[PDB]
Amino acid sequence: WGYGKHNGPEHWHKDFPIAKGERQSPVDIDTHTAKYDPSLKPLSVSYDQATSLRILNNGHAFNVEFDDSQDKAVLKGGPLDGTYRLIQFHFHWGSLDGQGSEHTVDKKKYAAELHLVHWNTKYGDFGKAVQQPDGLAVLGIFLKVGSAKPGLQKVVDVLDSIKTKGKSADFTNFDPRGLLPESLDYWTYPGSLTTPPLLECVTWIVLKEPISVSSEQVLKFRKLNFNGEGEPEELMVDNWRPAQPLKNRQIKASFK
Ligand SMILES: Clc1ccc(OCc2nnn[nH]2)cc1Cl
Ligand code: NA
Ligand SMILES: [Zn+2]
């Protein structure tokens, strides 16, 4: 599977029939229809003790991985019950600044989207968590092109060392707090992974406020390769799934 004409999102259902399921992601967020939920508790992003380890090009995106063997960096509150441990983050992005995000906001596409992936510690390990309807919480953050994001630059600068599929590099002492916007206002809904296996195991928390990154920063994302070393070059761009049918779901807002 991938993102090309011959193996992309319109093909995925043949090996992963849940691609046409009842709670697939991403979705369009219609801001006029999303409703404030006074019931949501405050969102708690607790990343002070986050321990990054490594950055990996897996042929689909690049992943920054964390030590999740203890409750270091966790996401709690909001729509969530219990404690979700940060395991990794990655992005999806476009070939052009007008596309690249997976979620859309009133059909608007952002240049990219950051996903911080967390798993529900009541299920003991990540593999067990993805088999549960409330196994994962993904914090989604839009990127728009404007001023540079200082906290992203250490990521940008290491991409030259993981150009191709299968390459990894040490990536210790990175603080993911530098990737967040000022506001934690969010939308939330029940959904799925946005790549195969497309499991319906995600509580989505999508921040309303985008972060700005510079044109130079996202240009360096676009120099990555889907291919492995020694293979014909396939630029890693447009690694996003389009919006899926909302079906029997309501998107809730944390804010008035
Ligand atoms: Cl660990 C991980 C890495 C990448 C990935 O991409 C698809 C995606 N993004 N947000 N939800 N699913 C999924 C996961 Cl669960
Ligand atoms: Na759920
Ligand atoms: Zn993602």
Q: How far is CA 88 from the centre of its chain?
A: 9
Is 195 labelled as part of a ligand binding site?
Answer: yes
Residue 13 appears among annotated catalytic residues: no
**What's the CATH code of the domain at 15?**
3.10.200.10
The tally of domains found in the chain comes to 1
First-to-last C-alpha distance (Å) of the chain: 40
Range of the domain at 113: 1-256
Is 103 labelled as part of a ligand binding site?
Answer: no
Between the CA of 123 and the centroid of ligand 2 the distance, in Å, is: 14
- Give me the catalytic one of 6, 13, 60, 103: 60
Whole-angstrom Cα distance, residue 171 to residue 169?
6
Ranges of H-type helices in 8-141: 126-129
Helix (H) or strand (E) segment spanning residue 203: strand 202-207
Closest ligand 1 atom, residue 140 Cα: 10
What does this entry list as its resolution, in Å? Answer: 1.4
Paired residues of 225 in beta bridges? 235
Whole-angstrom Cα distance, residue 197 to residue 205?
20
Mutate-to-test residue for ligand 1 from 16, 88, 115, highest number of ligand atoms within 8 A of CB: 115
Mutate-to-test residue for ligand 1 from 23, 126, 193, highest number of ligand atoms within 8 A of CB: 193
Q: Within 13 A of 26's CA, how many CA atoms are on the CB side?
A: 29
